[PDB]
Design an enzyme around this catalytic site. Structure first.
Site, mmCIF file in Angstrom:
data_model
loop_
_atom_site.group_PDB
_atom_site.id
_atom_site.type_symbol
_atom_site.label_atom_id
_atom_site.label_comp_id
_atom_site.label_asym_id
_atom_site.label_seq_id
_atom_site.Cartn_x
_atom_site.Cartn_y
_atom_site.Cartn_z
ATOM 1 N N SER B 47 0.837 -1.317 0.050
ATOM 2 C CA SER B 47 0.144 -0.106 -0.064
ATOM 3 C C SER B 47 0.815 1.345 -0.010
ATOM 4 C CB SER B 47 -0.919 -0.034 1.046
ATOM 5 O OG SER B 47 -1.939 -1.144 0.825
ATOM 6 N N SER B 95 -6.428 2.765 3.462
ATOM 7 C CA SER B 95 -5.843 1.880 2.460
ATOM 8 C C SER B 95 -6.695 0.946 1.759
ATOM 9 C CB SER B 95 -4.721 0.960 3.377
ATOM 10 O OG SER B 95 -3.630 0.806 2.492
ATOM 11 N N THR B 186 1.411 3.579 5.557
ATOM 12 C CA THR B 186 1.585 2.129 5.991
ATOM 13 C C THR B 186 1.595 1.204 4.749
ATOM 14 O OG1 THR B 186 -0.499 1.706 6.675
ATOM 15 C CG2 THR B 186 0.951 2.220 8.367
ATOM 16 N N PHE B 188 1.532 -3.598 3.770
ATOM 17 C CA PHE B 188 1.442 -4.657 4.364
ATOM 18 C C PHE B 188 1.014 -5.733 3.158
ATOM 19 C CE2 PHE B 188 -0.871 -8.085 6.959
ATOM 20 C CZ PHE B 188 0.142 -8.783 6.962
ATOM 21 N N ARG B 230 5.425 -2.063 12.782
ATOM 22 C CA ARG B 230 5.935 -1.085 11.678
ATOM 23 C C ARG B 230 5.936 0.152 11.996
ATOM 24 N NH1 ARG B 230 0.799 -1.956 7.455
ATOM 25 N NH2 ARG B 230 -0.906 -1.057 9.103
#
Ligand SMILES: *[B@@]1([O])O[C]([C]C([O])=O)C2=C1[C]=C(OC1=NC([N])=NS1)C([C])=C2[C]
Lengths: 244, 246
Positions: B47, B95, B186, B188, B230
């Site tokens: 993302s 996201s 962020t 993932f 993270r």
């Protein structure tokens, strides 16, 4: 277009405050207020004037770009929080009066007058000195006019570049969350006297999910201890409205 | 030049994770990392790709303007937070994978490839399907390249209009205080095994007083419960560096 919501008075009468809150969903065509008479009454903008002044500073090239640093010369300022180098966002957020007095001087009377006409900014009266007209001079603006001006800024419809409007908008962010964003600015002209009080403001807009809410609050103030009510009264009203 | 700060490794080992943090003060010419080898290693952006994808969507006109609303078709999505109409900032912040898969489809391969070349975006490999290359395809980018890319965005130096760069920057604001502002994203890719882990990212920049710090973090992730590391590992490093706190 504007309607009165008398239930919002609870929040004002509880603190013995004479003031107004104007709240508009989607556009300035759908507004509600606690006081229809005070909604169009005009007051000194005080530090809320940092919004048009920042846009004007960028437009005229007085402020080079978004990353301009306003250096402190090490000489005394009125507030300890102003005795440091500041970014444009920093100077707006800490309300650094001397930074904006210098920008206004560099803009000058002719250019300042032209932009306040373009922006339809209150009574457009910049008498009282180029570096003081919004603090103790003749400039006056209403809560309704603040909402109209902020809506134009939000839509990039002011007579300024879209780039300069976007820079001033990021400088105004005061709350950020994944689906909630607040742009705002406070104002305070001082405590005046009893019978001739000062004015305190809180103006801005809330973006919640895909909706937008424009707001403008002002109140008479003769006691500095009442200053936080400029944010808490509008916050309590927006909480009761489910905006939060 | 990039320097190694191996004293940062204790923040990774404490949590038994393998990862890298790249932190640059003022510019990408003054960077420090816990691991010089991993700082240049390239991983799926996941993302974090929503940043160039949003700029490209605006540049190509796929995204009309800053106030574009991405409507929900009422069909099931993976997250309840995605099952609603979203703004551009909303789609980036929550996201919302399906919104960006549709933008990528509309941009198409030729235009996507051209912009990733202009942006010097990782290995610029967009094979693996136009709507999946950044999630499970061949696209890879390093933490160092993320910092270079973000610095260009901060300075409005990307090959895109200053207006479009400014719109994407406001969409990236995650923390705001009078003299502290954070832009971040962020990423993932999904949980993997110990031998074939997924990757988790946290990238962005911090403006503190008149200073700017660019950062990029990635880690191997083989257990879903480790995902919040993270943000907590880079936060602990930035705290020890004096960026977070007075
Ligand atoms: B301003 O409206 O915002 C700040 C105060 C705050 O609460 O952040 C501020 C503003 C104006 C101002 O300068 C003034 N000059 C006159 N004549 N009246 S008010 C000052 C002193 C401050 C701190």
């Amino acid at each position: 277009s504007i309607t009165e919501n008398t239930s919002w008075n609870k929040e004002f009468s509880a603190e013995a405050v004479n003031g107004v809150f104007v709240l508009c969903k989607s556009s300035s065509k759908s507004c509600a207020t606690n006081d229809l008479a005070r909604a169009s009454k005009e007051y000194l903008p005080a530090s809320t004037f940092k919004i048009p002044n920042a846009i004007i500073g960028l437009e005229t090239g007085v402020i080079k770009n978004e990353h301009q640093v306003f250096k402190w010369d090490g000489k005394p300022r009125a507030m300890k929080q102003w005795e440091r180098d500041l970014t444009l966002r920093g100077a707006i957020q800490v309300s650094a009066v001397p930074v904006f007095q210098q920008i206004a001087r560099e803009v000058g009377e002719v250019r300042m007058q032209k932009y306040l006409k373009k922006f339809s900014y209150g009574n457009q009266n910049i008498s009282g000195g180029i570096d003081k007209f919004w603090l103790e001079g003749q400039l006056r603006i209403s809560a309704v006019n603040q909402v109209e001006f902020l809506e134009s800024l939000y839509l990039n419809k002011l007579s300024a570049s879209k780039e300069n409007q976007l820079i001033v908008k990021e400088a105004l962010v005061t709350e950020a969350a994944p689906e909630y964003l607040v742009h705002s600015k406070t104002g305070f002209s001082g405590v005046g006297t009893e019978s001739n009080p000062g004015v305190a403001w809180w103006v801005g807009w809330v973006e919640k999910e895909t909706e937008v809410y424009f707001f403008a609050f002002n109140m008479d103030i003769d006691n500095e201890s009442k200053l936080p009510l400029r944010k808490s009264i509008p916050t309590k009203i927006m909480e009761s409205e489910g905006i939060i």
